Amino acid sequence: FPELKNDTFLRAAWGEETDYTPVWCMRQAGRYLPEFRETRAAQDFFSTCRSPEACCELTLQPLRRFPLDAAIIFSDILVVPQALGMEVTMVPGKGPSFPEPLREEQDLERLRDPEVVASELGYVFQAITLTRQRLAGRVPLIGFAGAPWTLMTYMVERGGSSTMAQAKRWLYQRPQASHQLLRILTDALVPYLVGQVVAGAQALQLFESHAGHLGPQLFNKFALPYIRDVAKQVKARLREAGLAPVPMIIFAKDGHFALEELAQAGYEVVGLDWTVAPKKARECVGKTVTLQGNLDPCALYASEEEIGQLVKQMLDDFGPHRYIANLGHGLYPDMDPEHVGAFVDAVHKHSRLLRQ
Amino acid sequence: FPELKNDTFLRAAWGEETDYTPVWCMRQAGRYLPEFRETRAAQDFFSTCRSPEACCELTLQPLRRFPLDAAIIFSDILVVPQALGMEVTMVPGKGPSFPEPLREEQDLERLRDPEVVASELGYVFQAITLTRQRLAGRVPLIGFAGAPWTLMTYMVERGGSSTMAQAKRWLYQRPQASHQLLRILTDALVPYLVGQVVAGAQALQLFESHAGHLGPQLFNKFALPYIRDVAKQVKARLREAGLAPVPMIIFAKDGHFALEELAQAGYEVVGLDWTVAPKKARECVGKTVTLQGNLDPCALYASEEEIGQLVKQMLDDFGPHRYIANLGHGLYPDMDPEHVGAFVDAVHKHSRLLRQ
Numbered sequence A, B: 001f002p003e004l005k006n007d008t009f010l011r012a013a014w015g016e017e018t019d020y021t022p023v024w025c026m027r028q029a030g031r032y033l034p035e036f037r038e039t040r041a042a043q044d045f046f047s048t049c050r051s052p053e054a055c056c057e058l059t060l061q062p063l064r065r066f067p068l069d070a071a072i073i074f075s076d077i078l079v080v081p082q083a084l085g086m087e088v089t090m091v092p093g094k095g096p097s098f099p100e101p102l103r104e105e106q107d108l109e110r111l112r113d114p115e116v117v118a119s120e121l122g123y124v125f126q127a128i129t130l131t132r133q134r135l136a137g138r139v140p141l142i143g144f145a146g147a148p149w150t151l152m153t154y155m156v157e158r159g160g161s162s163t164m165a166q167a168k169r170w171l172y173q174r175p176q177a178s179h180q181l182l183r184i185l186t187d188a189l190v191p192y193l194v195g196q197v198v199a200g201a202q203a204l205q206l207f208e209s210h211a212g213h214l215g216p217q218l219f220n221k222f223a224l225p226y227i228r229d230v231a232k233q234v235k236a237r238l239r240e241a242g243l244a245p246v247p248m249i250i251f252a253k254d255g256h257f258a259l260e261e262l263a264q265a266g267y268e269v270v271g272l273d274w275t276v277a278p279k280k281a282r283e284c285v286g287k288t289v290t291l292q293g294n295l296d297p298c299a300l301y302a303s304e305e306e307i308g309q310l311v312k313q314m315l316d317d318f319g320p321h322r323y324i325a326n327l328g329h330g331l332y333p334d335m336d337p338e339h340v341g342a343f344v345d346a347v348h349k350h351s352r353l354l355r356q
């Protein structure tokens, strides 16, 4: 692979001093880009995901608009449940759906052995390699996957729940079957994530998007052990393969209650949602993890001038060390690309001013 | 009105020592009760709300099953937007809907003057009086309303949003119109809440159910001032009317980031969701507010034996002083009444053991 030109993102991830704060945005390849919609109009969603060229193109799109300090591959977290044997449909203007969720412990029987999952996701590896080659060292490439608990919620729920009541019913009523499912997911995720790095990913983000539906006690029993195992096992397998381990990012959305635990879970970076004050997060995690985030994505509905002032405040709170700027969640589909541009320019402008 | 027999709930609310921990459950009059469904089958939802006898009956139902230490009137937070002139429909198996949300600043013109709202909600006052008379002093009666921000989200959104992106777009793009709407809501809520107490309510809970979609900065600008004003103004009007002010409870769901602010907002009690560790909440709020909550409602899917152990742990964390037990949110419609029974008995059994 081509030699990396801008490695600011990796340097911040590992906790090193940099000349400016690196920035990227969750869902930077997304519907808010007119060119994304155009490209996506040509295949259905999961067919797009299975085309290395389409995936590479969508990844590159935001970089052509903004001097983002990292690319993130175009794919989806739900490819893992699908590779485990579940049917997932993209419902027009309504999102992902599993028409046949796991309903009882006996349904675990229709899942693939987790060890065969990486070979089912070869198309994602092809997209990563192609994208790493085409980026030609411009910025690092982030690969990613959903965390076990979050993936479980998609596998068990019949869609669009603000409570995850069915998924949580599993934890309380079927704890053994839940642990079994969470282990299956962990054992699929580890070789998949290793494969992403083998294929060229230079950093990994694990999305625990549904962390907030859990309190501390359930999170520590059912989410945290597997989060920990994913990091331990991936790092170990990369070492054994003779490869360099990549910085790993854990993002537990609405996971304020878990920050201390997450800072000791084997991840270089803890991503934060926008509800956590940067200073309080820094107290929780201490001084040896990098924090990523955390601007309210809706702040990008404000004027470019206002975005700049909000970014300035945010950077003041985080301070210059051990920090990668991002939003507190993904970009929304009605957002203005010029305002995303303003967010990028503002992190770069103010982070320099905060140093020199 | 009949003299109050069991005032444990009020004594804990004001912060006084009690012989046991008082307990009630949000949505204790709800679908999880077969008798509730039966009664509700006779009218449509908002027609039920407009019948003092139906409201009284639903309120009493849980008390006939469980020795709960408080009743809460049957009504809904959405009666306020409706009394302001918005049409709200109850969508079969899908919940409340505003077919015509406020879309722009100009839509504020179709709202009633907030001063006339209390007189539109006379039916709720009738339900409260009837219920206070029928309860005959058994336990205190809680009245309630939605907080301004939360009510705004219902008025502006086109339903079922996990982001409140439109409501938040208002805050960033239309801050002046947002403040105008939030003031209208505050000015409707104050005379309404005062009226509830005049009619017989012995405590008030304000539901900031959508607090979590905001971070600290937006919450402090747009939610907190009005929360503060509601308490200041209600207390003042009750004093002036020659009445005793009632304990007030603020419940900001997913409002971990606001606890310190909320403890100095003029409320006797801060209600907590289940994601906040009781000990951390106690550090945030200090020693002069009462905490209410906070058991994961899904914990009631566990066995009666498990519920007891979870309750015991919870009570250990909160300690005996300045505490009212409740769930961290409302009861879900698929929950077993016997397990709600188990939750009640367990708070009573263990809180005594924790004292004597």
Ligand SMILES: Cc1c2[nH]c(c1CCC(=O)O)Cc1[nH]c(c(CCC(=O)O)c1C)Cc1[nH]c(c(CCC(=O)O)c1C)Cc1[nH]c(c(C)c1CCC(=O)O)C2
Pocket: A025, A026, A027, A028, A029, A030, A031, A032, A072, A073, A074, A075, A076, A077, A078, A095, A096, A144, A207, A209, A253, A330, A331, A333
């Ligand atoms: C709508 C949706 C999809 N996939 C998913 C949803 C949300 C479903 C729900 O609310 O429960 C599920 C999903 N996909 C992803 C996550 C984790 C991140 C998160 O919490 O948002 C989750 C929870 C990562 C992703 N999913 C995707 C990426 C791509 C990285 C990038 O494109 O920049 C990631 C990290 C790509 C994707 N995937 C999808 C779209 C529309 C896109 C493009 C981005 C957009 O316009 O929203 C379909």
Ligand SMILES: Cc1c2[nH]c(c1CCC(=O)O)Cc1[nH]c(c(CCC(=O)O)c1C)Cc1[nH]c(c(CCC(=O)O)c1C)Cc1[nH]c(c(C)c1CCC(=O)O)C2
Pocket: B025, B026, B027, B028, B029, B030, B031, B032, B072, B073, B074, B075, B076, B077, B078, B095, B096, B144, B207, B209, B253, B330, B331, B333
């Ligand atoms: C489904 C629904 C209703 N009303 C509402 C919803 C949720 C809509 C959404 O998710 O956005 C809106 C609502 N109603 C209430 C709140 C605040 C409390 C909360 O966050 O849940 C909110 C956010 C108080 C209430 N709403 C109600 C009470 C009654 C107090 C009690 O019944 O014990 C309260 C405090 C009564 C009510 N109101 C409704 C039902 C079905 C019931 C019975 C309880 C149940 O089975 O869920 C309709």
